[PDB]
Amino acid sequence: CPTIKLKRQWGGKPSLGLHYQVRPIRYVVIHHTVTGECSGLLKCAEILQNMQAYHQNELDFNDISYNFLIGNDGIVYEGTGWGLRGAHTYGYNAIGTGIAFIGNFVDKLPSDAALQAAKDLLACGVQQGELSEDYALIAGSQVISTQSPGLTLYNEIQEWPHWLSNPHHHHHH
Template structure:
């Protein structure tokens, strides 16, 4: 059985900025079709994907999209939903294989990575900027859990759609840790699938998060989502379960 985080996980960058992680139980996940490899971390890479599905604007819609995506992935011979986490347009984060297990799609990459999917197609519209705040909160929590290094690279997964790739690239350029998807991140057999020109390596300062992250149970009706451009500041996690 996949381990469960009981209740909804709230990620707080500051008292006024709260983000939710909905665990597998809350979106109705199936059990993985075969055992998943353990993810020990810490990763040095965050890879951003798009689900190529309809977007979702409220938690109930997002849960349905994530549930259908898991069914589709398993039917395509994946052990489970392809990603570690997914982010909806409602700003909610949805647990895929989570922090404890490798995402099935990770076999394409030579370095340990956390794979995050943005729910939507983004062929004709830009990625909503508020989704970056949920991504930053997820990155901060991953670092606090020692699942992601303080110095890391964030990149986009290769896409067959040039428009979608541009939309995701524009979204990620707001991150100092961004590096365009290049061959040196892929396993040799995957390198022929991309012809992207490498950009110079980015020198990344330590980005250890520094504001408290609060954990609590909550129904998705009462979950509060807010965005902010403020930088996180250091504090120990506080855990509250009900």
């Protein structure tokens, strides 16, 4: 179980409105942030503070969109957090946990530390009853119109246990 850096520990603000999920969650959606690459809490904190400000005050979300974010040093940062509905993936916010790797992974992979931290986070979520034992792992790009989490990273997660090749998606309208 990785030690999660909670909102207070990175200087983050409260959610503007909490919406609870039904546990255990059966879907994990992997994303990248594109902007914000950073190593360690000292550097990452300001980046996360301003990402939160952009999401809350410009995109009109209740909090940073992702449930968790993972930096280059392998630190797991609480975004929206376990069991709360985020805003990372239409159709998969109420029923999924969204995890973003901080950085742009179209052409490279996250660090070994970051990848191992994600694996540790998933296994811990199952152990704690946050995720179902048979959860489905998907990339954002499989269900909404996005390049996230980047082709190189998408190719990596396809080799992980739990990867689901054919997830459903609904029409917005």
